[PDB]
Write a protein that binds this ligand. Structure first.
Ligand SMILES: *[C@H]1O[C@H](CO)[C@@H](O)[C@H](O)[C@@H]1O
Ligand SMILES: *[C@H]1O[C@H](CO)[C@@H](O)[C@H](O)[C@@H]1O
Ligand SMILES: [Zn+2]
Ligand SMILES: [Zn+2]
Ligand SMILES: [Zn+2]
Ligand SMILES: [Zn+2]
Length: 325
């Protein structure tokens, strides 16, 4: 068994949604390789919270996990909690009837006021799922032995639908060979260790660093020392507080950011680090690379992933990288 599903980005690629059949209802979930919970909007929510969102409707065979509960919080003061159900979930043709579904009956603003987003599908390691009293398996993990190969690949596109492959690699999605690196699951994430980086045509930095691959995150969050070195090559850039991070003229084209992985160069086009205007029709533009200060962890998000074909292989574990076709 294998399958592929299409993912379309919101506005300026701020969150990629993917159709997923949960129960009998079809929802549009956000695939996050940074978390391990699968939660959706439930009927138990306030009507004014439901508005703008498809809600989860149990199957006739589903079974409510009595006594269990789940609660999660993310990067910002963004929470969600609720009950747990054992229903059927279908993603790109791969089906399972023992997937745990986390129904939310209480959530934060960010979620409620994000019409269209109907919840999340976590693809990190199951060890960090938050269900209680017994943690549950992610979807991938749950269908792992139904897949021709125990892996999945992602191909995110800029301002265009990408794709999530389950259990197989589509050779038409990348050019040249796949380079593999050992994944560090120590914190429950798909971590890895780049050997260095390179700003524009500069000379690569032998000094490596530890990073996680988080599809659920829009930007590239690195250590301040690196950010500062980067924007030093962007004319007119400034640490505009009361705006989030660094900004510069939209007309400016920033240099590429290369991430060295063994002998492979994962080059993020400068064009993608010119994220978007701080305001409608604004003159200045927000950068794709900001500071990870406050998380203490380096994250390579959608901006980095928009140029790679990434393979998440449970065997090792390991991550594979290839220049997107
Ligand atoms: C309850 O839900 C299941 C899943 O869609 C169906 O197979 C059944 O016929 C009934 O609608
Ligand atoms: C950014 O653009 C300015 C243009 O004034 C240059 O002076 C600088 O070296 C960098 O290329
Ligand atoms: Zn198959
Ligand atoms: Zn929807
Ligand atoms: Zn995430
Ligand atoms: Zn370039």
């Amino acid at each position: 068994s294998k399958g592929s599903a299409v993912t379309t980005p919101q506005n300026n690629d701020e969150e990629y949604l993917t159709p997923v059949t949960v129960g009998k209802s079809t929802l549009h979930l956000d695939f996050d390789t940074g978390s391990a919970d699968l939660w959706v909007f439930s009927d138990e929510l306030p009507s004014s919270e439901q508005t703008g969102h498809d809600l989860y409707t149990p199957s006739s065979s589903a079974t409510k996990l009595s006594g269990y509960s789940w609660d999660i919080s993310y990067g910002d003061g963004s929470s969600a909690s609720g009950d747990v159900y054992r229903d059927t979930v279908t993603v790109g043709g791969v089906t399972t009837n023992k997937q745990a579904v986390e129904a939310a009956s209480k959530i934060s603003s960010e979620f409620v006021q994000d019409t269209a987003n109907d919840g999340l599908l976590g693809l990190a390691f199951s060890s960090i799922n938050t269900v209680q009293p017994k943690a549950q398996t992610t979807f991938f993990d749950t269908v792992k032995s139904q897949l021709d190969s125990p892996l999945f690949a992602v191909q995110l596109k800029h301002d265009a639908p990408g794709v999530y492959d389950f259990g197989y690699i589509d050779d038409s999605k990348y050019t040249g060979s796949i380079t593999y690196t050992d994944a560090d699951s120590s914190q429950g994430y798909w971590g890895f260790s780049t050997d260095g980086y390179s700003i524009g045509d500069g000379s690569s930095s032998s000094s490596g660093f530890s990073a996680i691959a988080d599809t659920g995150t829009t930007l590239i969050l690195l250590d301040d020392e690196i950010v500062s070195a980067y924007y030093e090559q962007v004319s007119g850039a400034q640490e505009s507080y009361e705006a989030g991070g660094y900004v510069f003229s939209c007309s400016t084209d920033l240099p590429d950011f290369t991430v060295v992985i063994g002998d492979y160069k994962a080059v993020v086009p400068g064009k993608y680090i010119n994220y978007a205007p701080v305001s409608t029709g604004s003159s200045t533009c927000y950068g794709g690379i900001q500071s990870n200060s406050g998380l203490g962890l380096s994250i390579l998000g959608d901006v980095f992933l928009k140029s790679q074909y990434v393979v998440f292989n449970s065997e090792g574990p390991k991550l594979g990288f290839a220049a997107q076709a």
